[PDB]
């Protein structure tokens, strides 16, 4: 039906059935996650297999079958045979190393469990970064990606609990998201804060003047290197775009995009232009010396805009010689049979 309620209920229900106890359950899971790490690494050590490989195979056995490997990541790990081979060496690990295998999985599980339980934490957090320009679910989701990030770095050895830790690792993920996706035309985090400061400043300035600050105040109040050109520029970037599809004039049925003209497209006038221009330019180009005319025709009309580098083997003196003498005979006879005079442009 309506999407917020369902997810809210979705995780709230699972937290309702499994909140994590203050100390115990978070400690427990934590301990298991770490041992997983130490396990996987020691597994990498005895198998010669990359900790990335050991990590994804235990994931498949605990989080999902061939189905989760095939659709998400296209196909480099054979759905069946590949991961299985890897699990076989894990079994071969005697009593000593097999232990790490068994631990790794159990650790991987605990992880997910801690992640599940601390989902209310995200939503409670994400709840306040609401009106920034991101959808509540989008916001919770990035924040969620943030809590997962925290899970990777928390050191249970250092007594502090995951609550305060997740807080930071989530708030960072959210704010970033807000700064990276909120706008159509991307704006770096610095410009963002920049814009917030500009706004806030305009606020304290509205406080007493009764005059929406000329871009003079804003510069001053802002600080060190702020000037009129800077503020006029930032607020110009601050305006989000406008909907090309917007109700125009008497909103009856007006759509903003039929009114903008087009520039690359040669309106008829221009197609006729290039027709005569090219035909006449082509006529002159033929009844001539192909030594310095084509040089300046090709150097100017074919590739890019170098007198010396313009002519093949013959130096500058023959360039300027034929350039200026042929360019003038061409112009002065074109002065006779006036065809070019009427500036095609």
């Amino acid at each position: 039906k309506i999407s917020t309620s369902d997810p809210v209920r979705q995780y709230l229900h699972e937290i309702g059935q499994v909140p994590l106890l203050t100390l115990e359950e978070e400690v427990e899971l934590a301990r298991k996650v770490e041992e997983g790490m130490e396990a996987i690494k020691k597994l990498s050590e005895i198998t010669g297999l990359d900790p990335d490989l050991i990590r994804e195979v235990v994931r498949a056995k605990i989080l999902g079958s061939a189905r989760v490997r095939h659709i998400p990541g296209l196909k480099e790990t054979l759905d069946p045979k590949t991961v299985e081979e890897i699990d076989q060496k894990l079994k071969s690990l005697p009593k000593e190393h097999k232990r790490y295998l068994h631990i790794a999985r159990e650790g991987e599980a605990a992880r997910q469990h801690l992640i599940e339980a601390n989902l209310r934490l995200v939503v409670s957090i994400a709840k306040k970064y609401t009106g920034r320009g991101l959808s509540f679910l989008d916001l919770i989701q990035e924040g969620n990606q943030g809590l997962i990030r925290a899970v990777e770095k928390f050191e249970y050895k250092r007594r502090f609990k995951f609550s305060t830790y997740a807080t930071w690792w989530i708030r960072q993920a959210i704010n970033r998201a807000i700064a990276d996706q909120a706008r159509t035309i991307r704006i770096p985090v610095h410009m963002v804060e920049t814009i917030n400061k500009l706004s806030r400043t305009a606020r304290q300035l509205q406080q007493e003047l009764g005059r929406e600050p000329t871009y003079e105040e804003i510069a001053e109040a802002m600080g060190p290197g702020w000037d009129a050109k800077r503020v006029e520029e930032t607020l110009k970037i601050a305006q989000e775009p406008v909907s090309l599809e917007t109700p125009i004039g008497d909103e009856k049925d007006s759509f903003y995009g039929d009114f903008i003209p087009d520039e690359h497209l040669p309106s008829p006038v221009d197609a006729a232009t290039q027709s005569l221009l090219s035909e006449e330019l082509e006529k002159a180009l033929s009844k001539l010396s192909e030594r310095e005319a084509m040089v300046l025709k090709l150097r100017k009309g074919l590739i890019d805009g170098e007198e010396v580098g313009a002519f093949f083997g013959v130096t500058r003196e023959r360039i300027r010689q034929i350039e200026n003498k042929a360019l003038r005979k061409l112009k002065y006879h074109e002065s006779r049979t006036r065809k070019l005079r009427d500036f095609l442009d």
């Binding site: 106890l21 203050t22 100390l23 115990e24 400690v27």
Partner: protein
Amino acid sequence: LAAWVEKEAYKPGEILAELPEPYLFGDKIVAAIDPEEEVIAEAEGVVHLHEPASILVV
């Protein structure tokens, strides 16, 4: 868990003598000397709290 705490059984085979005074006339510890979910180098890595009895139907 508690095995290492009271070093008697994890250090040497003393869990049998851990049963205090009637032994003169698998786990079996003293009458009642420990009250935490900890590691005992120095009572540092701890967690004194609750104890579940979660029934798994398996």
